[PDB]
């Protein structure tokens, strides 16, 4: 099923951060990770009140 092999090959984790993420069809776990990480983690890192 090369067709798919190619599809998945490309069609995958696609995000540019900054409130712009694209979860492929796989999502499931891939997403769960990013899905969660992204956003929340973005705010944390964006915050981290405290230098060095």
Tab-separated table of N, CA, C and O in Angstrom:
chain	number	residue	atom	x	y	z
A	1	UNK	N	0.841	-1.185	0.000
A	1	UNK	CA	0.000	0.000	0.000
A	1	UNK	C	0.885	1.248	0.000
A	1	UNK	O	0.833	2.051	0.931
A	2	UNK	N	1.679	1.371	-1.054
A	2	UNK	CA	2.575	2.507	-1.187
A	2	UNK	C	1.772	3.802	-1.055
A	2	UNK	O	2.195	4.732	-0.369
A	3	UNK	N	0.628	3.822	-1.723
A	3	UNK	CA	-0.238	4.989	-1.689
A	3	UNK	C	-0.236	5.580	-0.278
A	3	UNK	O	0.106	6.745	-0.089
A	4	UNK	N	-0.623	4.748	0.678
A	4	UNK	CA	-0.670	5.172	2.067
A	4	UNK	C	0.730	5.502	2.587
A	4	UNK	O	0.946	6.566	3.166
A	5	UNK	N	1.645	4.571	2.362
A	5	UNK	CA	3.019	4.750	2.800
A	5	UNK	C	3.459	6.186	2.513
A	5	UNK	O	4.093	6.825	3.351
A	6	UNK	N	3.104	6.654	1.324
A	6	UNK	CA	3.454	8.004	0.916
A	6	UNK	C	2.621	9.006	1.716
A	6	UNK	O	3.159	9.962	2.272
A	7	UNK	N	1.320	8.754	1.748
A	7	UNK	CA	0.408	9.622	2.471
A	7	UNK	C	0.933	9.888	3.883
A	7	UNK	O	1.245	11.026	4.229
A	8	UNK	N	1.014	8.818	4.661
A	8	UNK	CA	1.497	8.922	6.028
A	8	UNK	C	2.887	9.561	6.026
A	8	UNK	O	3.168	10.446	6.832
A	9	UNK	N	3.721	9.087	5.112
A	9	UNK	CA	5.075	9.600	4.996
A	9	UNK	C	5.060	11.116	5.204
A	9	UNK	O	5.693	11.625	6.128
A	10	UNK	N	4.331	11.794	4.331
A	10	UNK	CA	4.226	13.241	4.408
A	10	UNK	C	3.211	13.618	5.489
A	10	UNK	O	3.586	14.089	6.562
A	11	UNK	N	1.943	13.396	5.169
A	11	UNK	CA	0.872	13.706	6.101
A	11	UNK	C	1.235	13.170	7.486
A	11	UNK	O	0.979	12.006	7.793
A	12	UNK	N	1.826	14.045	8.287
A	12	UNK	CA	2.227	13.674	9.634
A	12	UNK	C	2.320	14.917	10.522
A	12	UNK	O	1.918	16.006	10.114
A	13	UNK	N	2.852	14.713	11.717
A	13	UNK	CA	3.003	15.804	12.666
A	13	UNK	C	3.389	17.079	11.912
A	13	UNK	O	4.504	17.191	11.406
A	14	UNK	N	2.445	18.007	11.863
A	14	UNK	CA	2.672	19.270	11.181
A	14	UNK	C	2.242	20.421	12.091
A	14	UNK	O	1.052	20.612	12.338
A	15	UNK	N	3.234	21.160	12.566
A	15	UNK	CA	2.973	22.288	13.444
A	15	UNK	C	4.087	23.324	13.280
A	15	UNK	O	5.222	22.976	12.959
A	16	UNK	N	3.723	24.578	13.509
A	16	UNK	CA	4.677	25.668	13.391
A	16	UNK	C	4.742	26.461	14.698
A	16	UNK	O	5.358	27.524	14.753
A	17	UNK	N	4.097	25.913	15.717
A	17	UNK	CA	4.074	26.556	17.020
A	17	UNK	C	3.536	27.981	16.870
A	17	UNK	O	3.410	28.487	15.757
A	18	UNK	N	3.234	28.588	18.010
A	18	UNK	CA	2.714	29.944	18.020
A	18	UNK	C	1.204	29.937	17.778
A	18	UNK	O	0.673	30.830	17.118
A	19	UNK	N	0.553	28.920	18.325
A	19	UNK	CA	-0.885	28.786	18.177
A	19	UNK	C	-1.236	28.367	16.747
A	19	UNK	O	-2.079	28.988	16.104
A	20	UNK	N	-0.570	27.316	16.294
A	20	UNK	CA	-0.799	26.806	14.952
A	20	UNK	C	-0.231	25.390	14.844
A	20	UNK	O	0.925	25.207	14.468
A	21	UNK	N	-1.071	24.423	15.184
A	21	UNK	CA	-0.667	23.028	15.131
A	21	UNK	C	-1.641	22.226	14.265
A	21	UNK	O	-2.833	22.530	14.220
A	22	UNK	N	-1.099	21.217	13.599
A	22	UNK	CA	-1.905	20.369	12.738
A	22	UNK	C	-1.614	18.902	13.057
A	22	UNK	O	-0.526	18.404	12.772
A	23	UNK	N	-2.606	18.250	13.645
A	23	UNK	CA	-2.470	16.849	14.006
A	23	UNK	C	-2.958	15.978	12.846
A	23	UNK	O	-4.119	16.062	12.448
A	24	UNK	N	-2.046	15.163	12.337
A	24	UNK	CA	-2.369	14.277	11.231
A	24	UNK	C	-3.466	13.303	11.665
A	24	UNK	O	-4.029	13.440	12.751
A	25	UNK	N	-3.739	12.342	10.796
A	25	UNK	CA	-4.759	11.346	11.076
A	25	UNK	C	-4.307	10.430	12.216
A	25	UNK	O	-5.126	9.980	13.016
A	26	UNK	N	-3.007	10.183	12.253
A	26	UNK	CA	-2.436	9.329	13.282
A	26	UNK	C	-2.856	9.848	14.659
A	26	UNK	O	-3.368	9.090	15.482
A	27	UNK	N	-2.623	11.135	14.867
A	27	UNK	CA	-2.971	11.763	16.130
A	27	UNK	C	-2.796	10.750	17.264
A	27	UNK	O	-1.698	10.590	17.794
A	28	UNK	N	-3.896	10.094	17.602
A	28	UNK	CA	-3.878	9.100	18.664
A	28	UNK	C	-2.847	9.461	19.735
A	28	UNK	O	-3.129	10.257	20.629
A	29	UNK	N	-1.675	8.859	19.608
A	29	UNK	CA	-0.600	9.106	20.554
A	29	UNK	C	0.134	10.390	20.162
A	29	UNK	O	0.234	11.321	20.959
A	30	UNK	N	0.629	10.398	18.933
A	30	UNK	CA	1.352	11.552	18.425
A	30	UNK	C	0.675	12.811	18.972
A	30	UNK	O	1.329	13.656	19.581
A	31	UNK	N	-0.626	12.896	18.734
A	31	UNK	CA	-1.397	14.038	19.196
A	31	UNK	C	-1.326	14.145	20.720
A	31	UNK	O	-0.719	15.072	21.253
A	32	UNK	N	-1.956	13.183	21.379
A	32	UNK	CA	-1.971	13.158	22.832
A	32	UNK	C	-0.735	13.885	23.364
A	32	UNK	O	-0.836	14.702	24.277
A	33	UNK	N	0.404	13.561	22.770
A	33	UNK	CA	1.659	14.173	23.172
A	33	UNK	C	1.614	15.670	22.863
A	33	UNK	O	1.454	16.489	23.768
A	34	UNK	N	1.756	15.984	21.585
A	34	UNK	CA	1.733	17.368	21.145
A	34	UNK	C	0.459	18.041	21.661
A	34	UNK	O	0.526	19.034	22.384
A	35	UNK	N	-0.673	17.473	21.269
A	35	UNK	CA	-1.960	18.006	21.683
A	35	UNK	C	-1.859	18.606	23.087
A	35	UNK	O	-2.221	19.763	23.298
A	36	UNK	N	-1.365	17.794	24.009
A	36	UNK	CA	-1.214	18.231	25.386
A	36	UNK	C	-0.048	19.214	25.506
A	36	UNK	O	-0.245	20.378	25.851
A	37	UNK	N	1.142	18.710	25.213
A	37	UNK	CA	2.340	19.529	25.283
A	37	UNK	C	2.026	20.930	24.755
A	37	UNK	O	1.891	21.875	25.531
A	38	UNK	N	1.919	21.020	23.437
A	38	UNK	CA	1.623	22.290	22.795
A	38	UNK	C	0.588	23.063	23.617
A	38	UNK	O	-0.173	22.469	24.379
A	39	UNK	N	0.594	24.375	23.432
A	39	UNK	CA	-0.334	25.235	24.146
A	39	UNK	C	0.099	25.421	25.602
A	39	UNK	O	0.756	26.405	25.936
A	40	UNK	N	-0.285	24.459	26.427
A	40	UNK	CA	0.055	24.504	27.839
A	40	UNK	C	1.559	24.707	28.034
A	40	UNK	O	1.980	25.649	28.704
A	41	UNK	N	2.328	23.809	27.437
A	41	UNK	CA	3.775	23.878	27.536
A	41	UNK	C	4.285	25.203	26.963
A	41	UNK	O	5.290	25.738	27.428
A	42	UNK	N	3.567	25.692	25.963
A	42	UNK	CA	3.934	26.944	25.323
A	42	UNK	C	3.793	28.118	26.293
A	42	UNK	O	4.609	29.038	26.282
A	43	UNK	N	2.752	28.049	27.110
A	43	UNK	CA	2.495	29.094	28.086
A	43	UNK	C	3.504	29.011	29.232
A	43	UNK	O	3.984	30.034	29.716
A	44	UNK	N	3.796	27.783	29.633
A	44	UNK	CA	4.739	27.552	30.715
A	44	UNK	C	6.097	28.148	30.336
A	44	UNK	O	6.626	28.999	31.049
A	45	UNK	N	6.622	27.676	29.215
A	45	UNK	CA	7.908	28.150	28.733
A	45	UNK	C	7.831	29.659	28.489
A	45	UNK	O	8.780	30.387	28.776
A	46	UNK	N	6.692	30.084	27.963
A	46	UNK	CA	6.478	31.492	27.678
A	46	UNK	C	6.442	32.314	28.968
A	46	UNK	O	6.715	33.513	28.952
A	47	UNK	N	6.101	31.637	30.054
A	47	UNK	CA	6.026	32.288	31.351
A	47	UNK	C	7.321	32.089	32.140
A	47	UNK	O	8.171	32.978	32.179
A	48	UNK	N	7.431	30.918	32.750
A	48	UNK	CA	8.608	30.592	33.537
A	48	UNK	C	9.122	31.835	34.265
A	48	UNK	O	10.316	32.127	34.237
A	49	UNK	N	8.193	32.534	34.902
A	49	UNK	CA	8.537	33.740	35.637
A	49	UNK	C	9.852	33.517	36.387
A	49	UNK	O	9.883	32.815	37.396
A	50	UNK	N	10.904	34.128	35.865
A	50	UNK	CA	12.218	34.005	36.472
A	50	UNK	C	13.307	33.874	35.404
A	50	UNK	O	13.212	33.027	34.517
A	51	UNK	N	14.314	34.727	35.523
A	51	UNK	CA	15.419	34.716	34.580
A	51	UNK	C	16.466	33.683	34.998
A	51	UNK	O	16.708	33.486	36.189
A	52	UNK	N	17.060	33.049	33.998
A	52	UNK	CA	18.075	32.042	34.248
A	52	UNK	C	17.681	31.189	35.457
A	52	UNK	O	18.468	30.367	35.924
